Design an enzyme around this catalytic site. Structure first.
Site, mmCIF file in Angstrom:
data_model
loop_
_atom_site.group_PDB
_atom_site.id
_atom_site.type_symbol
_atom_site.label_atom_id
_atom_site.label_comp_id
_atom_site.label_asym_id
_atom_site.label_seq_id
_atom_site.Cartn_x
_atom_site.Cartn_y
_atom_site.Cartn_z
ATOM 1 N N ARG A 38 0.803 -1.214 0.000
ATOM 2 C CA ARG A 38 0.000 0.000 0.000
ATOM 3 C C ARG A 38 0.843 1.275 0.000
ATOM 4 O O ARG A 38 0.453 2.276 -0.599
ATOM 5 C CB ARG A 38 -0.943 0.005 1.198
ATOM 6 C CG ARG A 38 -2.067 1.017 1.068
ATOM 7 C CD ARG A 38 -2.784 1.213 2.382
ATOM 8 N NE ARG A 38 -3.920 2.121 2.243
ATOM 9 C CZ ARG A 38 -4.423 2.832 3.244
ATOM 10 N NH1 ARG A 38 -3.886 2.741 4.456
ATOM 11 N NH2 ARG A 38 -5.454 3.639 3.037
ATOM 12 N N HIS A 42 0.373 4.399 -2.540
ATOM 13 C CA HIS A 42 0.216 5.794 -2.155
ATOM 14 C C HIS A 42 1.391 6.660 -2.582
ATOM 15 O O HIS A 42 1.273 7.884 -2.644
ATOM 16 C CB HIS A 42 -0.027 5.921 -0.650
ATOM 17 C CG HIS A 42 -1.423 5.556 -0.243
ATOM 18 N ND1 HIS A 42 -1.928 5.823 1.012
ATOM 19 C CD2 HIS A 42 -2.427 4.973 -0.938
ATOM 20 C CE1 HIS A 42 -3.186 5.423 1.070
ATOM 21 N NE2 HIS A 42 -3.514 4.904 -0.100
ATOM 22 N N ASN A 70 -3.522 8.892 4.411
ATOM 23 C CA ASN A 70 -2.363 8.308 5.083
ATOM 24 C C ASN A 70 -2.389 8.380 6.603
ATOM 25 O O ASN A 70 -1.956 7.446 7.279
ATOM 26 C CB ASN A 70 -1.073 8.972 4.601
ATOM 27 C CG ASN A 70 -0.727 8.606 3.181
ATOM 28 O OD1 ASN A 70 -0.794 7.441 2.798
ATOM 29 N ND2 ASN A 70 -0.337 9.598 2.394
ATOM 30 N N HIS A 170 -6.420 -5.713 -2.218
ATOM 31 C CA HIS A 170 -7.268 -5.909 -1.053
ATOM 32 C C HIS A 170 -7.554 -7.393 -0.826
ATOM 33 O O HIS A 170 -8.523 -7.755 -0.162
ATOM 34 C CB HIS A 170 -8.573 -5.116 -1.211
ATOM 35 C CG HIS A 170 -8.384 -3.631 -1.136
ATOM 36 N ND1 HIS A 170 -9.375 -2.733 -1.471
ATOM 37 C CD2 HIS A 170 -7.316 -2.886 -0.757
ATOM 38 C CE1 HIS A 170 -8.925 -1.500 -1.304
ATOM 39 N NE2 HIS A 170 -7.679 -1.566 -0.872
#
Ligand code: HEM
Ligand SMILES: [Ca+2]
Ligand SMILES: [Ca+2]
Ligand SMILES: [O]
Length: 306
Positions: A38, A42, A70, A170
């Site tokens: 992740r 990001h 975040n 996910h």
């Protein structure tokens, strides 16, 4: 242009050092592989994969760590520092934080049981962080499918396959109750749950996330295999068991004519999913990179070199 062999001469053992760091951390924190994947996501969605997300606050610019997507969510930063220090020992001032994070993401996926591949390398580190851009560019779980598509297109990923395959991230990891409270008790101001959430699973989630309960409580994104990187995430969607709104919309949105066949395709074949995931991952990792002499090779991923 980025190339998988970028460090084969300057730091051939970089991938092994990264893997060892993650293997070790996984023993005390089984969630770290998911967290690292992740972080890369990001990173890439804000000015490209330039390790901008790793920078801490300075009096001239704010850290992306305080972005809505975040703050009290992104994690694993100390682990990245650990592997960076280990790589700096093996090969001083050679591997950029941006590349290190890309490799870390791939190794995390492989370690969790996913595909194995050599990521393109040669990215360099940013000279600043972009908090406002992070707030504008990171998608949110309450986004509609059109908004999710807009978010991906905004950073350079036009393909629905990019969106469907990457959402496969996910297939493991955790999610805070806060992000699904609306789906469970009052979706879109109806006072009713999201109709696209399987009613049996709804009861299970309500038990994990009761009204007025601890919003920071963590739930698994994939009820089938919580920590294994596989295509089960898509099987869940087909049964209306996607955890967050943005997950289920890939299969149930009125605008999902193009995403539904992809969801089914990935649910039907691990190979089809893995191939698409690697393809999309490399595309995401190719978003506006700094290369050549642009940017720098950060020595401490938290601060710009001085
Ligand atoms: C398509 C839009 C996406 C949305 C709206 C979204 C949303 C979220 C949310 C709400 C969380 C929970 C954060 C928390 O509870 O603190 C999360 C976690 C996570 N996401 Fe996404 N995500 C998206 C795409 C992706 C992509 C592209 C990847 C990677 C390829 C990814 C990988 C992960 C992972 C592995 C976790 C678990 C992290 C951990 O447990 O530390 N997500 N995401
Ligand atoms: Ca970035
Ligand atoms: Ca899984
Ligand atoms: O995410």
């Amino acid at each position: 242009q980025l190339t998988p062999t970028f460090y084969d001469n300057s730091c051939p053992n970089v991938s092994n050092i990264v893997r060892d760091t993650i293997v070790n951390e996984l023993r005390s924190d089984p969630r770290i592989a998911a967290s690292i994947l992740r972080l890369h996501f990001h990173d890439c969605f804000v000015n490209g994969c330039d390790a901008s997300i790793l920078l801490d606050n300075t009096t001239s610019f704010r850290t992306e760590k305080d972005a809505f997507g975040n703050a009290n969510s992104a994690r694993g930063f100390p682990v990245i520092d650990r592997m960076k220090a280990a790589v700096e020992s093996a090969c001083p001032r050679t591997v950029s934080c941006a590349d290190l994070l890309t490799i870390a993401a791939q190794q995390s996926v492989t370690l969790a049981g996913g595909p194995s591949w050599r990521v393109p390398l040669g990215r360099r580190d940013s000279l600043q962080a972009f908090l406002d851009l992070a707030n504008a560019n990171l998608p949110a779980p309450f986004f509609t499918l059109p908004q999710l598509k807009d978010s991906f297109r905004n950073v350079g990923l036009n393909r629905s396959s990019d969106l469907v395959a990457l959402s496969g991230g996910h297939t493991f990891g955790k999610n805070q109750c806060r992000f699904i409270m609306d789906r469970l008790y009052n979706f879109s101001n109806t006072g009713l749950p999201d109709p696209t959430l399987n009613t049996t699973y709804l009861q299970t989630l309500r038990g994990l996330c009761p009204l007025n309960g601890n919003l920071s409580a963590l739930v698994d994104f994939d009820l089938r295999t919580p920590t294994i990187f596989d295509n089960k995430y898509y099987v869940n969607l087909e049964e209306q068991k996607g955890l967050i709104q943005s997950d289920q919309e890939l299969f149930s949105s009125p605008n999902a004519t193009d995403t539904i066949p992809l969801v089914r395709s990935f649910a039907n074949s691990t190979q089809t999913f893995f191939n698409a995931f690697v393809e999309a991952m490399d595309r995401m990792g190719n978003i506006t990179p700094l290369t050549g002499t642009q940017g720098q090779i950060r020595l401490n991923c938290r601060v710009v070199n001085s």
